[PDB]
Write a protein that binds this ligand. Structure first.
Ligand code: ADP
Ligand code: ADP
Ligand code: MG
Ligand code: MG
Lengths: 704, 367, 181
């Protein structure tokens, strides 16, 4: 526009009002409205059109005259001071966590005010999305999904329980499933929640709580499904990051009549915990309760971590209270502590060089008591387990004449990668036994249709990004593909319905970004599975092969060309910059190969399955119903895969989402401290640009 | 902000920003291609490995020095040196700062032009300047008067400077030290039955030229007791386990630098080229040139200089005049420690050749 | 799809698809014709038995090893070895897979040519390559540097490889172990 006030780039608030008093080809001489003497220069991507009266807000954001990404930011700045936390932006609901209890908006009188009424007949609320999902299920003959993204603590936990409260109170009229999520609230927190630099307590798996509806349309059951729990985090942690929270709550919160049974020591004595952060979270009363023998040198030197909602000393106590509430027995809870403590003494075993004759690798002299105190926890013989962690057993029998069983030793690096592959198998099959035990405390009556909630970790970005953030952000790019796929389909089901027109827009595709990461022996994940196979794996050869063959692609440049100055310190074969939906995020390639290269030997996979304990043999499947046992030996698949097993399980979730309808609820966190009324425009503007909301506004060209 | 002193070594390229410590990167300039057919099939191999990476993989390459006889062989190899130097050591893009380059005294024209011109077009620096390597050791020693020595593999030079003006009419450039000392050591160690035909193995010759050799005080008289039964053997160990016991050749190799008639060439010894540059200066200045004889360059690191040089000069110099020779510690980094002081300080912040000035002026801006 | 590694040993010919466990079939390199008059009149016998069955029929045949001192004697016997290997061991059609064949390091020209030509025209494979047996023994212990001593019946070899280049001028072939033993 010309003359009319436009938005101006303001440091703390994101955008401020301002006018244009001289102009260039792409640089604008911006005079601020409220700071007129500062008169700076600003670019085309820092100026946006603004509405005539600033004395208004919009309930229906499609009603804007100037609809852009700066006027969406101004609408949730005014509505936050009007006690309105819900905002209708087309088929996308923007919910802002206020960090206090607003008067009469979550009440039972509020629930029967919305009941059965459609969008555009009631103002913005999360109960108008939950009521839409029951009507766009039975009539439409389509199962539903509520998709929740955003940064941890942004309201993605809280809006989900208000949806499942609304589907039980408004339409189930009972059915005991609503507070069974609540009764095992710290129980599912400990196993999947970890600590990242950007998030103090974030769940690292795809929690998919589905709610079954039958042919009669009554709520007949629920089921809890889990997807994509981070494999690498189990064994390796970065600077100031942790493992899962049960590996700190069991270390801190275990009593002295339980610690003498489990043989626990402070985290500096456990190899899978001492490489990250060993500090526990606490509160003023529990910081006095953590014992002198439970403290690591990090805790002795720097004490407990700071955060008002986190206490790792007390939540192991409130976890075991929750096992009484959900449905776990007193004999079995003790066996659920021997397996967790067995993972901690699995990481301490170590393997040195060859002695002389017959090559191979042997254990270290200081790793003898580390295997004996672990083999009574995982139920294995102390003499037989040393052989399986050091040799590769195979046969001369395979297709011709009958032979015998031969022994080919493993290399030192093949034994270090094999010991960590066992810990990424045991804790992963333990977590399916905790979830499957919980799903049997409310077994469903029948099935036909379902309204589920997909909640996943958001787009994560730190100062230095690793392999853990490459696999999280690759999951958010595919979920961003499915976001834009349903929005283009919605406008196509709108223009001949209301008679608006035959107008059509050039779709926002991302296939070159997908083909860059995964393909048919062309992607980055395709090169990564090739590097695991090489005679001697390297870290210099993995980076250099990506810009050898994938050079032509636009969404890939060398780290030294980085727009952000900080990543220019990194050199050619140390990293790469990958452009995504939420921007260009650079990743280092240090330990990227090392986290991918775990592999599990056949008679080591067929040794932990052969366990000399009874709770342990139940863990590696399969159930009694239609019983059929796992074979003694195999050959194939050796390497198996890490980065392809993470891609394969994600493809099982993207095709389930394609059979369901969409209910996209984006959650915005207003401030860092998580306090009422506070506002940060250096964090709010960043979450509109990292949640895919910008890509939707840049697909909306309608003008209707 | 800061300027970068990146020294175009004869050896031994040195790189580090201006102040406050010591050079950050040192490596011996070489490029090496893989000289045999591959069989491991990664493929995984670079078109050319530069140093230091080309010296951690000896015996499977064909080493090619880019700096030979005091001039660069071609900028096809040189640009790849430059790219390696900035990128996998210092970690900065050349467009960030004014740079500072060094050259050899009496450099062939237009090979300082063509260089200056190519470096501006290849790396796109915001400013450029070239200082001579001998002159920079003046700043390193902190002096105002005296004759300056940049002696590297293989062009040395002898420049006289007076308070603080340089003299165009007395500068002497010798094609001798140090690659002729390397090549000669290989020619007189072959003389005791150890052959080293291949380029990669020639590097081993340089490494014993560094470590085990020393300068005789009185050649004829050290040579006499070497001819006696007396043990001058120091036992070196080789990469394949070979044990070599060298004696005579150990003090013979650096001695080559005095009286080049060992080769048979006409060129005068450092003894006399030092002196003849002083006796090409005006008579009154000579008074303060004695006792400001300051040596530098890594090829002067041998033990026994400068007090051989001292005793020899004192014999040739006029009677009842004092000559003390100044030998710095850490002479290998002398030139760089020169450059570091200059480019960090005012006045010379406004004395660079800047981008517009260069664009307007063209290649004839160097002189 | 799945490639086939078929090893032209002088043992102990080895056959199995590409990875990941062990050779599917191993048997001695023997073809053997019947040296006695037939009198039971089934007739029931073959014109030539290959191994395994030519090692169950000892004392009634005249065993002919088709590979002798590092070279195959003639391709008439060799093709019958091949036919046995693909068909009654691996079972797969030859037109189905790309194959991978092995040779001896330093084997006489034009015995790789004549081989490649005859094998393409006889079995009609869709693609192929020939890798030398010593070089492959690097991969088994997964080292990128070192001197390889690969010793099988009837040719041993001493091949030096350094990260990851094989010196053409330092390779030694001995025609000694194991048939002379
Ligand atoms: N301790 C030593 N004794 C004798 N010669 C040495 C010693 N250290 C280094 N050198 C020689 O000095 C050379 C390096 O000299 P340098 O000052 O780098 O010259 P430039 O700066 O002109 O390249 C090397 O080629 C090496 O042979
Ligand atoms: N345990 C053993 N001890 C000694 N020699 C053996 C043993 N097992 C097999 N051999 C010999 O090794 C030979 C097989 O070697 P092999 O690796 O098959 O060579 P190639 O692969 O070149 O055919 C047989 O001829 C046999 O004589
Ligand atoms: Mg020099
Ligand atoms: Mg062989």
């Amino acid at each position: 526009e010309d003359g009319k006030p436009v938005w101006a780039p303001h440091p703390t608030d994101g955008f401020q009002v301002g006018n244009i008093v001289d102009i260039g080809p792409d640089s604008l001489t911006i005079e601020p409205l409220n700071q007129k003497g500062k008169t700076f220069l600003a670019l085309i991507n820092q100026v946006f059109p603004a509405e005539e009266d600033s004395k208004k807000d919009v309930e229906d954001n499609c009603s804007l005259m100037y609809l852009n990404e700066a006027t969406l930011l101004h609408n949730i700045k005014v509505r936050y001071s009007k006690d309105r936390i819900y905002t209708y932006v087309a088929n996308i609901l923007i919910a802002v966590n206020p960090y206090f209890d607003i008067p009469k908006i979550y009440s039972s009188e509020t629930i029967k005010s919305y009941q059965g009424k459609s969008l555009g007949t009631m103002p913005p609320h999360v109960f108008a999305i939950a009521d839409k999902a029951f009507r766009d299920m039975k009539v439409l003959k389509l199962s539903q999904s509520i998709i929740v993204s955003g940064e941890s603590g942004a309201g993605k936990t809280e809006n989900t329980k208000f949806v499942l409260r609304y589907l039980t109170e408004s339409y189930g009229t009972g059915q005991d499933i609503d507070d069974r999520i609540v009764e095992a609230n710290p129980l599912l927190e400990a196993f999947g929640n970890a600590k990242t630099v950007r998030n103090n307590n974030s769940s690292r798996f795809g929690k998919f709580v589905e709610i079954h509806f039958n042919e009669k349309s009554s709520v007949v059951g629920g089921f809890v499904s889990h997807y994509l729990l981070e494999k690498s985090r189990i064994c390796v942690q970065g600077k100031e990051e942790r493992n899962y929270h049960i590996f700190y709550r069991l270390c801190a919160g275990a009593s002295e009549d339980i610690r003498e049974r489990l043989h626990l020591s402070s985290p500096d004595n456990f190899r899978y915990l001492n490489r990250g952060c060993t500090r526990y979270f606490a509160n003023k009363e529990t910081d006095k309760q953590i014992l002198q023998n439970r403290k690591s040198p990090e805790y002795l030197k720097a004490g407990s971590l700071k955060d008002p909602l986190l206490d790792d000393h007390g939540d192991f106590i409130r976890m075991c209270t929750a096992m009484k509430k959900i449905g776990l027995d007193d004999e079995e809870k003790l066996d659920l502590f021997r397996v967790v403590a067995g993972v901690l003494h699995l990481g301490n075993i170590d393997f040195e060089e060859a002695g002389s004759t017959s090559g191979g690798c042997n254990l270290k002299n200081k790793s003898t008591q580390a295997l004996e105190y672990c083999a009574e926890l995982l139920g294995l013989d102390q003499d037989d387990l040393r052989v399986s962690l050091t040799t590769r057993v195979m046969l001369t029998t395979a297709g011709g004449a009958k032979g015998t069983v031969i022994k080919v030793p493993l290399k030192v690096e093949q034994a270090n990668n094999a010991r960590d592959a066992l810990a990424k198998t045991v804790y992963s099959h333990l977590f399916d036994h905790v979830v499957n035990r919980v799903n049997q405390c409310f077994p469903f009556e029948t099935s036909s249709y379902f309204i589920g909630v997909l909640d996943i970790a958001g787009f994560e970005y730190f100062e230095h990004n690793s392999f853990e953030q490459f696999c999280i952000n690759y999951c958010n790019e595919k979920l961003q593909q499915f976001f834009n796929e349903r929005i283009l389909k919605e406008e196509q089901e709108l223009y001949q319905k209301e008679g608006l027109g035959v107008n059509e827009v050039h779709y926002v595709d991302n296939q070159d970004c997908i083909d860059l990461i995964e393909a048919r022996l062309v992607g980055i994940l395709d090169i990564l599975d090739e590097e695991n196979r090489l005679p001697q794996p390297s870290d210099q050869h993995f980076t250099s092969a990506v810009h050898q063959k994938h050079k032509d692609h636009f969404r890939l440049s060398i780290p030294r060309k980085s727009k952000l100055a900080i990543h220019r310190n990194i050199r050619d074969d140390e990293g790469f910059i990958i452009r995504h939906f939420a921007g260009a995020v650079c990743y280092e390639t240090t330990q990227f190969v090392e986290k991918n290269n775990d592999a599990l030997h056949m008679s080591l996979e067929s040794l932990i399955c052969e366990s000399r304990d009874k709770f342990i043999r139940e863990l590696f499947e399969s159930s009694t119903n239609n019983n059929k046992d796992t074979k003694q030996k195999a050959g194939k698949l050796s390497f198996i895969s890490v980065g392809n097993k993470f891609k394969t399980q994600l493809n099982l979730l993207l095709d389930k989402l394609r059979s369901t309808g969409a209910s996209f609820i984006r959650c915005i966190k207003p401030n860092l401290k998580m306090t009422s009324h506070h506002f940060e425009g250096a964090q709010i503007l960043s979450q509109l640009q990292c949640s895919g909301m910008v890509s939707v506004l840049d697909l909306m060209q309608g003008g209707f | 902000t800061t300027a970068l002193v990146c020294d175009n070594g004869s050896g031994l390229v040195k790189a580090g920003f201006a102040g406050d410590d010591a050079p950050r990167a040192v490596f011996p300039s070489i490029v090496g291609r893989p000289r045999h057919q591959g069989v491991m099939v990664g493929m995984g191999q670079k078109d050319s490995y530069v140093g230091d990476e080309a010296q951690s993989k000896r015996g499977i390459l064909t080493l090619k020095y880019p700096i030979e006889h005091g001039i660069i062989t071609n900028w096809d190899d040189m640009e790849k040196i430059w790219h390696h130097t900035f990128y996998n050591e210092l970690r900065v893009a050349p467009e960030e700062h004014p740079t500072l380059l060094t050259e050899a005294p009496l450099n062939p024209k237009a090979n300082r032009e063509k260089m200056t011109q190519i470096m501006f077009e290849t790396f796109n620096v915001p400013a450029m300047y070239v200082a001579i390597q001998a002159v920079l050791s003046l700043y390193a020693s902190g002096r105002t008067t005296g004759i300056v020595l940049d002696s590297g593999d293989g062009v040395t030079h002898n420049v006289p400077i007076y308070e603080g003006y340089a003299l165009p009419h007395a500068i002497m450039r010798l094609d001798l030290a140090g690659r002729d000392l390397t090549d000669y050591l290989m020619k007189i160690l072959t003389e005791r039955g150890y052959s080293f035909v291949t380029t990669a193995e020639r590097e081993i010759v340089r490494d014993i030229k560094e470590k085990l050799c020393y300068v005789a005080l009185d050649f004829e008289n050290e040579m006499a007791t070497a001819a006696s039964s007396s043990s001058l053997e120091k036992s070196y160990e080789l990469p394949d386990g070979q044990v070599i016991t060298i004696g005579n050749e150990r003090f013979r190799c650096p001695e080559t630098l005095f009286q080049p008639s060992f080769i048979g060439m006409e060129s005068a010894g450092i003894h006399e080229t030092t002196y003849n540059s002083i006796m090409k200066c005006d008579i009154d200045i000579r008074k303060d040139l004695y006792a400001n004889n300051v040596m530098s360059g890594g090829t002067t690191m041998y033990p026994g200089i400068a007090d051989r040089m001292q005793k020899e000069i004192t014999a040739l110099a006029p009677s009842t005049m004092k000559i003390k020779i100044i030998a710095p510690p850490e002479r290998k980094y002398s030139v760089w420690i020169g450059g570091s002081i200059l480019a960090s300080l005012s006045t010379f912040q406004q004395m660079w050749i800047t981008k517009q000035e260069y664009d307007e002026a063209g290649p004839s801006i160097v002189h």
